Amino acid sequence: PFFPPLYLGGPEITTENCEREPIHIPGSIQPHGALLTADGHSGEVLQMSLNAATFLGQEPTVLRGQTLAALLPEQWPALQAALPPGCPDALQYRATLDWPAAGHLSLTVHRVGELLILEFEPTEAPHALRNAMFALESAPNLRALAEVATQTVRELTGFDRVMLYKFAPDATGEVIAEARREGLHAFLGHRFPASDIPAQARALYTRHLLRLTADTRAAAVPLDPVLNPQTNAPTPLGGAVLRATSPMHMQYLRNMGVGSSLSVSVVVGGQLWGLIACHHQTPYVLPPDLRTTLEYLGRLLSLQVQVKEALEH
Amino acid sequence: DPLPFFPPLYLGGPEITTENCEREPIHIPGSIQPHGALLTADGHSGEVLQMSLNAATFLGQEPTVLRGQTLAALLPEQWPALQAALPPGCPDALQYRATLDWPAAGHLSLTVHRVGELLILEFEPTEPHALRNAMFALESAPNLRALAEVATQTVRELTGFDRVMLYKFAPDATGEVIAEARREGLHAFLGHRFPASDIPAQARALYTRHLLRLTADTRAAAVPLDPVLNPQTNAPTPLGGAVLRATSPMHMQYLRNMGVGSSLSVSVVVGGQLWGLIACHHQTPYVLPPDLRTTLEYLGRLLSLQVQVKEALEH
Numbered sequence: 185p186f187f188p189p190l191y192l193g194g195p196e197i198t199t200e201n202c203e204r205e206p207i208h209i210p211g212s213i214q215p216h217g218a219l220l221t222a223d224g225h226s227g228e229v230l231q232m233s234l235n236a237a238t239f240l241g242q243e244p245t246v247l248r249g250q251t252l253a254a255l256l257p258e259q260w261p262a263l264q265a266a267l268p269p270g271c272p273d274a275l276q277y278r279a280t281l282d283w284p285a286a287g288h289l290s291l292t293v294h295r296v297g298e299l300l301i302l303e304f305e306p307t308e309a310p311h312a313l314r315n316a317m318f319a320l321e322s323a324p325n326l327r328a329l330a331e332v333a334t335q336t337v338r339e340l341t342g343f344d345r346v347m348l349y350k351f352a353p354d355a356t357g358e359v360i361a362e363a364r365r366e367g368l369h370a371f372l373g374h375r376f377p378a379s380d381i382p383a384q385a386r387a388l389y390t391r392h393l394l395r396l397t398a399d400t401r402a403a404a405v406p407l408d409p410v411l412n413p414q415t416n417a418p419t420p421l422g423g424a425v426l427r428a429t430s431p432m433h434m435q436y437l438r439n440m441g442v443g444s445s446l447s448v449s450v451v452v453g454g455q456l457w458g459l460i461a462c463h464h465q466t467p468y469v470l471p472p473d474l475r476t477t478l479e480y481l482g483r484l485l486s487l488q489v490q491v492k493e494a495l496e497h
Numbered sequence: 498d499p500l501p502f503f504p505p506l507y508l509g510g511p512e513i514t515t516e517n518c519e520r521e522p523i524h525i526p527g528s529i530q531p532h533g534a535l536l537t538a539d540g541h542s543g544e545v546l547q548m549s550l551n552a553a554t555f556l557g558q559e560p561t562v563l564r565g566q567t568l569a570a571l572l573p574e575q576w577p578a579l580q581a582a583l584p585p586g587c588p589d590a591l592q593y594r595a596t597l598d599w600p601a602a603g604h605l606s607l608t609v610h611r612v613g614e615l616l617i618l619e620f621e622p623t624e625p626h627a628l629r630n631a632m633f634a635l636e637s638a639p640n641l642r643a644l645a646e647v648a649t650q651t652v653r654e655l656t657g658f659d660r661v662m663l664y665k666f667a668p669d670a671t672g673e674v675i676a677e678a679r680r681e682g683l684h685a686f687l688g689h690r691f692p693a694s695d696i697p698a699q700a701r702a703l704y705t706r707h708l709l710r711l712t713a714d715t716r717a718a719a720v721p722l723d724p725v726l727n728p729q730t731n732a733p734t735p736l737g738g739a740v741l742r743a744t745s746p747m748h749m750q751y752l753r754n755m756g757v758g759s760s761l762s763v764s765v766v767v768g769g770q771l772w773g774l775i776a777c778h779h780q781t782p783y784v785l786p787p788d789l790r791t792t793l794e795y796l797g798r799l800l801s802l803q804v805q806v807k808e809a810l811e812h
């Protein structure tokens with residue numbers, strides 16, 4: 185099963201109970217964005233991140249009464265149609281708001297049962313993706329495909345290190361390709377125990393395909409209330425990219441000297457084949473539109489891995 | 498019966514009838530569609546060899562001036578990028594794309610690929626979260642039918658085409674329209690089947706490697722390359738990888754007879770075989786700009802993946 189989260193007086197995580205940390209329900213988010221939850225029917229704002237006032241520019245109480253209808257007039261009917269009752273928690277809808285306080289915000293919404301989860305992040309506003317797609321497809325074998333993928337991602341993102349991390353049948357991981365800035369350790373060829381990515385994190389990574397830590401020293405921002413009014417239970421945040429990263433894993437990143445971390449799941453035959461794993465030495469908020477490019481690349485790599493593995497077997 | 502290609506018309510080959518469909522050498526028509534321009538150049542020196550006859554009007558230069566310069570001089574910023582992206586021996590399927598600001602012609606999209614020692618350069622005029630939203634909707638579709646319906650509707654919304662169909666090949670290469678989105682008033686093609694010769698065997702092979710082709714105007718005359726043969730080889734210039742390549746006259750007559758002014762199709766490739774086609778029709782001529790066509794190319798790949806996934810959920 186899972187332990188209760190901390191804020192419901194559950195045990196603190198150690199290397200003895202790695203498998204039982206409820207990483208999906210931390211009750212908090214990373215501070216480079218803001219999150220609201222809301223009722224599926226009424227559009228009634230039920231929870232907000234204590235930092236919402238910053239991003240939205242709204243007097244705190246104003247929000248926690250109001251309706252999405254009021255708050256987001258153009259958007260609220262689109263949401264209603266895009267995310268019908270009963271849809272999967274994996275389905276997401278995005279829009280760009282030109283919002284008074286903040287030039288442009290990206291809005292990302294998904295639905296978990298009766299709750300809409302809304303994420304707001306700063307945003308903005310060429311051929312590198314098309315060029316990359318063809319490059320991946322003409323790679324002659326899996327090894328070269330891995331090399332092209334890591335190089336392409338590094339060029340698109342500027343990340344200090346990009347790896348392709350492949351899982352063995354026992355969930356033992358191996359760095360099979362790597363693109364990195366001059367003057368970093370090389371993790372190419374190294375293998376790592378399955379417990380570094382514990383079972384409950386691999387399962388969530390099979391369904392929700394991109395996650396990140398933007399700053400491995402930033403404090404999480406609580407949800408208020410912490411419990412969902414609807415249920416008097418924790419809000420599931422595993423489909424939210426703003427979801428606070430497990431401190432156990434933030435500690436693992438700080439000990440490596442990493443300030444910023446992102447990965448994309450590569451999913452083949454319904455199973456987690458590997459990760460595009462990215463490191464930055466300093467804090468780094470990759471903007472939403474560039475993340476989208478990596479999300480596309482994730483799908484394309486999933487296709488090409490199967491194609492390429494089929495021409496060996 | 499499968500038989501080798503006839504020589505093209507310009508090398509004294511025969512004219513194509515219902516009898517000899519499968520032997521038309523559609524990859525080497527010696528000509529392009531008039532809404533863009535094409536140059537060929539030597540892959541090592543960058544000497545310009547062939548150009549479409551309309552090139553002066555896209556590029557704003559006399560032929561003899563174009564042909565008298567190397568790509569190093571014509572494309573000083575792109576020439577080194579081309580050479581890195583398209584190394585000798587690379588496959589003909591690999592494409593490099595850039596946007597140019599050309600004085601006379603505005604923003605041009607440049608698409609380049611390499612066939613042996615030849616570079617092929619295509620120039621076309623070029624111009625929010627719809628793709629991301631579509632990607633997730635496709636993935637959440639519960640079964641093959643719902644996927645097919647979401648895919649057709651999405652493509653129609655992105656493009657404004659009068660008809661978008663998902664055409665699926667059977668094992669005998671006959672095809673069936675298994676989903677479609679269509680303009681009000683058009684008659685349904687859903688559930689209809691069409692014989693294997695409708696898309697002959699040398700088109701199907703080409704459609705497994707080069708995943709998008711189009712006819713922007715089913716009545717437009719093709720524009721010859723000049724000279725027609727590659728001076729490197731005194732042989733035909735391979736245009737199978739060029740979206741500008743002229744469509745087979747057989748296929749154009751087939752489309753005009755259906756009342757179609759514009760056609761586009763994307764290949765859906767599963768396990769190395771052509772599974773089906775995203776096939777679009779417009780009643781009037783219609784040019785879809787290169788950046789919009791890129792969205793369809795990306796959806797072609799997504800759909801190939803999702804078709805595998807939906808079919809595996811099915812035994």
Ligand SMILES: *C/C=C1/C(=C/c2[nH]c(/C=C3[NH+]=C(/C=C4\NC(=O)C(C=C)=C4C)C(C)=C\3CCC(=O)O)c(CCC(=O)O)c2C)NC(=O)[C@H]1C
Nearest residue numbers: 198199202207371376380381385429430433436445446447
């Ligand atoms: C007591 C449990 C431990 C633990 C927990 C844990 N680990 C993750 C997720 C990841 N761990 C990763 C490990 C590596 N990163 C590398 O670069 C290498 C090798 C060079 C390894 C072995 C990775 C890549 C992830 C994925 C996330 C990312 O992209 O950074 C989680 C889940 C965190 C979350 O999503 O909130 C958890 C709870 N890790 C341990 O090492 C043990 C001590």
Ligand SMILES: *C/C=C1/C(=C/c2[nH]c(/C=C3[NH+]=C(/C=C4\NC(=O)C(C=C)=C4C)C(C)=C\3CCC(=O)O)c(CCC(=O)O)c2C)NC(=O)[C@H]1C
Nearest residue numbers: 514515518691694695696700744745747748760761762776
């Ligand atoms: C004697 C040969 C004939 C022939 C040739 C031919 N066909 C193609 C390619 C295509 N044919 C298509 C036919 C259809 N369009 C539809 O809407 C339906 C069903 C409702 C069918 C059966 C299609 C879709 C294609 C693909 C390209 C496209 O138009 O989007 C070629 C190759 C064309 C080229 O790349 O230059 C050729 C030579 N078709 C016949 O019917 C016989 C008489």
